[PDB]
């Protein structure tokens, strides 16, 4: 799922860049002709707004963690069996050691 969102964001960014290039070409043509104070066509403006909204949707979905405020639910499935043993004090005197000695 995240890969699809990343691809959609990339496609939206590419569409935005293409709309930018089209607007730049429009302004370059406008500089050619005297007067004719007209705005850029509305179709490209709608396309760039569509690219603005599409990339704005996946940018929220990419980084969603929203971890729970309560910390009692994170030590909830953990049992006391694993907590009893500690990495610090570790005695290497067990029957399994001499059981596994020969293979």
């Amino acid at each position: 799922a995240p890969s699809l969102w990343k691809g959609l964001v990339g496609i939206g960014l590419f569409a935005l860049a293409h709309a930018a290039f089209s607007a730049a070409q429009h302004r370059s043509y406008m500089r050619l002709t005297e007067k004719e104070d007209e705005s850029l066509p509305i179709d490209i403006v709608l396309q760039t707004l569509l690219a603005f909204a599409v990339t704005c949707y996946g940018i929220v979905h990419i980084a969603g963690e929203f971890k729970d405020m309560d910390a009692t639910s994170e030590l909830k499935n953990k049992t006391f069996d694993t907590l009893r043993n500690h990495p610090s004090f570790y005695v290497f005197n067990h029957r399994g050691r001499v059981l596994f000695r020969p293979s």
Binding site: T79, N93, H94, R95, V98, L99
Partner: protein
């Protein structure tokens, strides 16, 4: 009085010890009450700190609830120490032995050794202590407590070689996982199939 146990109980005890080779293990043997003492099967009680009675309270009460359902009786209680160089019963073990001896007239304490605990077991590797309410604490030097030593050796070797002893469940796992039972059905099917 001779002591005799079924290879199923011994295999269960050995596999319970193998499941947690780093902490002390506990077990309860079950007999039939209707001179030699015949054992039917064993149920593993707890593991870890192994110094708590009120959990043993619930364990033993549920054990009794099960014995009055299938017409069984509790014979003895077995415990293995953590350190390899330790073959002496503890105070809690003696207390449980006296508690069981109040009801039943024959409770043997089984100490599982750690020095001779390897892949290819010789045979007995079991310490039998006979305790009572008085200061009588005697350990039997050596006798025969199992029926078919070669066959039992073969089943034990097959069970230990094949990594199928992770299905063994404990009473603590029953509390943590209600899904898991504590009668060891798969173990019973396996020992029946092997024979």
């Amino acid at each position: 009085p001779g002591v005799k146990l079924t290879t199923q109980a011994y295999c269960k005890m050995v596999l319970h010890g193998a499941k947690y080779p780093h902490c002390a293990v506990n077990g309860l043997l079950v007999a039939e009450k209707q001179h030699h003492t015949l054992f039917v099967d064993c149920i593993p009680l707890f593991h870890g700190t192994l110094a708590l009675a009120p959990m043993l309270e619930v364990a033993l009460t549920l054990i009794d609830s099960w014995c009055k359902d299938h017409s069984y009786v509790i014979a003895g209680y077995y415990q293995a120490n953590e350190r390899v160089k330790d073959a002496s019963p503890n105070q809690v073990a003696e207390k449980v032995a006296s508690r069981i001896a109040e009801g039943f007239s024959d409770t043997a304490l089984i100490m599982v050794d750690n020095t001779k605990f390897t892949m290819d077991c010789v045979a007995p590797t079991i310490h039998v202590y006979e305790h009572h309410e008085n200061r009588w604490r005697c350990r039997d030097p050596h006798h025969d407590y199992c029926e078919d030593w070669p066959e039992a050796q073969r089943i034990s070797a097959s069970l230990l070689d094949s990594r199928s002893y992770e299905t063994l469940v404990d009473f603590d796992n029953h509390l943590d996982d209600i899904r898991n039972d504590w009668t060891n059905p798969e173990i019973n099917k396996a020992v029946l199939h092997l024979c």
